[PDB]
Amino acid sequence: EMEKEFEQIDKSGSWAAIYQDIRHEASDFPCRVAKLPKNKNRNRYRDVSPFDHSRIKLHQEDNDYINASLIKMEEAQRSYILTQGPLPNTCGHFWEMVWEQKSRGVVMLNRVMEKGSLKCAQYWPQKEEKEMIFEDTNLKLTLISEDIKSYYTVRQLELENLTTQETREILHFHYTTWPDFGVPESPASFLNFLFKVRESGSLSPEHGPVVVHCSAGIGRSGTFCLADTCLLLMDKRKDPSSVDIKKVLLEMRKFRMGLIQTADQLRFSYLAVIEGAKFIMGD
Ligand SMILES: [Mg+2]
């Protein structure tokens, strides 16, 4: 069981040590498309790049590049797209990816401004009557409704392909209370948010993969996917304590580098999975 594993690491304060073994053992694959000079302004951070083998391609002839990775968890029957927070010049590419991949939900785990700097472009409309048009990709985005809660906001958006005049409804799930420094003190509001995403149908296989992002698309975003997949595998398996968080995380790191950025985030992920196990074992 991992509940016991948690107490050992915490008793000996050896989280930084666990985290380093994960770093040394993580996969490394080429990211040649990301490092081409023509793509330098499509990357928010120089050291965070999608692997070539799992990167999402835009259906543009000119330049198909977006900093986004497909994470495929075969046993759990879950797929996720992890991406960076859009930049002023990639908002249109972001929504084009959502359209092309048939995603139903976008999960945002950061605020537009944190620590006094901009972490993400404001890529969705703030008022019903002021829609946004992305001229480069021929997409129109309208805010339909907005439900603000204490720890998160859910928005219904309408995405219209101006070329085909088709429209889809997209749900935007915005976790607004992640602290500027460190990790939340309790996983309760995080787990509540995760179960609301689940309940919406956005993670379900009838739809394209959910789009998940924070600023770099690896830290908070990694925590979200790791917790979801681990909890799903506990539902599925004959022996729920056969789920090894560390193994699951290394499998996900084959698809995008750097998932889980700090030892603090690793500890938090254990905590969320352990607490979430209470509700998945029928309570
Ligand atoms: Mg108003």
Q: Is 104 annotated as a binding residue?
A: no
Name 67's Cβ contacts closer than 8 Å, sequence gap at least 6: 34, 42, 43, 44, 48, 49, 50, 83, 84, 90, 217
106 alpha carbon – ligand 1 mean position (Å): 23
Q: Is 68 annotated as a binding residue?
A: no
Q: Is 180 annotated as a binding residue?
A: yes
130 alpha carbon – ligand 1 mean position (Å): 10
The reported resolution of this PDB entry, expressed in Å, is: 1.9
- One-letter amino acid of 44: R
d(CA 79, CA 229): 9
**Which domains does the chain show, CATH number per domain?**
1-281 (3.90.190.10)
Q: Judging by DSSP bridges, how do beta strands 152-161 and 139-148 pair with one another? A: antiparallel
Query: For the sheet containing 210-213, what is the strand order?
Result: 55-57, 65-73, 78-83, 210-213, 105-108, 166-175, 152-161, 139-148, 132-134
Is 75 in a helix, a strand, or coil? Answer: coil
150 alpha carbon – ligand 1 mean position (Å): 19
Q: Is 120 annotated as a binding residue?
A: no
127 alpha carbon – ligand 1 mean position (Å): 6
- Residue count of the chain: 283
Q: Helix, strand, coil: what percent of the chain each, to 5?
A: 35, 25, 40
124 alpha carbon – ligand 1 mean position (Å): 15
- Among 5, 52, 44, 9, residue whose Cα is nearest residue 27: 52
Q: What are the contacts of 245-252 at 24+ separation with CB within 8 A? A: 245/2, 245/269, 245/270, 245/273, 246/18, 246/22, 248/73, 249/22, 249/222, 250/22, 250/25, 250/26, 250/27, 251/73, 252/71, 252/73, 252/222, 252/225, 252/226
Q: Is 222 annotated as a binding residue?
A: no
Q: Tokens 């690491």 map to which residue?
A: 9
230 is catalytic: no
Experimental method of this PDB entry: X-ray
Q: Is 282 annotated as a binding residue?
A: no
202 alpha carbon – ligand 1 mean position (Å): 27
Contact in structure between 71 and 226 (CB atoms under 8 Å)? no
Is 128 in a helix, a strand, or coil? Answer: coil
**Catalytic annotation, pick one of 31, 91, 120, 214:** 214
Q: Judging by DSSP bridges, how do beta strands 152-161 and 166-175 pair with one another? A: antiparallel
**Neighbour-count burial of 156, counting CB atoms closer than 10 A to its CB (0-12 exposed, 13-18 middle, 19+ buried):** middle
